[model samples]
Target: KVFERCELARTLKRLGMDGYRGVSLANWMCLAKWESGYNTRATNYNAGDRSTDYGIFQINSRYWCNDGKTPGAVNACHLSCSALLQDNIADAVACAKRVVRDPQGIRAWVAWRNRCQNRDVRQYVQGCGV
Candidate 1:
């Protein structure tokens, strides 16, 4: 599913993404925009590490989800990488929550730092009424 901007904003809010772990909804919106462009089935394989990022949040197989092929990977989210690719996004959101629980907080996603950190991100949800 490739979600419209506001639709994804509203959906993320409903899924409890607003201010989750002190990260604002707009920041999440920005992360998704850069990470996967709101496409639920997005995937990126990292040839350097032999791992893959899955779904909208780009949850990685290195530490978040199990793909059974990423060497030395751990399933911290206790879910298969396939779960992150679903259109529902519920599982992806859950795993993202777990990710923020770490000390890095929202910085777990490099895209957030490069595209959203200290930038004007409110535009992502400005007209979403979220």
Candidate 2:
């Protein structure tokens, strides 16, 4: 939970998640609580599925980090998430901003959250003057 509250959570607060897409830090906390249990050093490895999905976002093995190839730039990946994990979580708060600024397709990752729970994803992403 330290990773959630310290790195990811506080980062979202700094961005004023509510100011942009309404993605509050609480939202991040919920996700982190579910995803990696706020464990930065955690690594996932199943029998048939041997991918390098790690960190707080479970950001896949090929998005930003090197995974099994490189040393797995956790800090870089964290920066990427802190930068574009959501629409309003960045410097510019907007859904379009996420699409434009999201190089690693973090927006796509966020979509999977709603899809995983079979819930409408729109509520998780707000702002846009709505």
Candidate 3:
């Protein structure tokens, strides 16, 4: 989680995300803790993976990388790491942010935030909670 955390912090700052300093760090630490236990080598044994996700965020190689016929959508790989801050951190961040911005309320995120709260070294990354 070394480079990933630092890389994400730099990414968020570059994105003009003002304030939420505490929240950003907390969220990164927490989400990574939840998603891959901060293990770059981590992978879901039963899910069928060849390379096992790389980096601190645990982004699946098949999805995060553009291998033409494989994940066809190069958008994921070509995206600026800054613009795709959440992409590097795991899709959950983008999902949480979208949920937080929802006018209808982030009930789903709130539920998840509650479910995973304080179960790690940090708090919820960025959501209705923290």
Candidate 4:
């Protein structure tokens, strides 16, 4: 699902992403915008590590979800990587929450650092009553 900006904001808020682990709602919006452009089916394969990033949060196979292909990978979320591709974002949201529980927090997503960090991200949830 390719979500509109505010639509995703409201949905994330409802899923308790507003302040999960000290990460703000707008920051989460910014991360999703840069990571997957609000598309639930988005994916990116890492040729170097042979790991694939899945879904809206781009949860990775190497250390988050199990794809049965990434060598020596750890399924920290204990979920199938296929679950992240669903249009319903519940699973993806849960996995993302698990990710931030680590010491890195939201910095686990490189896109968030490149595009969201130190930037004005309020526009990501500017309207639509999020």
Candidate 1's C-alpha lDDT?
A: 0.95
How do the residues 47-73 of candidate 2 rate in per-residue lDDT, one tens digit apiece? 444445555555554444344443333
lDDT of 3 at 15: 48
TM-score to native of every candidate shown: 0.98, 0.45, 0.36, 0.97
Per-residue lDDT of candidate 1, residues 81-127 (tens digit): 99999989999999999999999999988888899999999799997
User: Which pairs of residues collide in model 2?
Assistant: 21-126
lDDT of 4 by residue, 1-130 (tens): 8998888888898999988999999999888888888999999999999999999999999999999999999999999999999999999999999999999999988888899899998888886697
Rate residue 81 of model 4 by lDDT: 99
Q: Distance from true position, residue 112, model 1, in Å?
A: 0.8
User: Which regions of candidate 2 deviate over 4 angstroms?
Assistant: 4-8, 15-22, 46-49, 68-130
Clashing pairs in 1: none
Query: Candidate 4 versus the native: TM-score?
Result: 0.97
Itemize residue pairs with steric clashes in candidate 3. Answer: 27-125
Report the lDDT of model 2 for residue 119: 44
| Cα lDDT computed for each candidate against the true fold | 0.95, 0.44, 0.42, 0.92
> Could you give the C-alpha RMSD of every candidate to the true structure, in order shown?
0.6, 8.3, 8.1, 0.7
Q: Give me the overall lDDT of model 3.
A: 0.42
Those runs of model 1 whose alpha carbons end farther than 4 Å from true positions after fitting are none
lDDT of 3 at 129: 33
Q: Give the winner by lDDT: 1 or 2.
A: 1
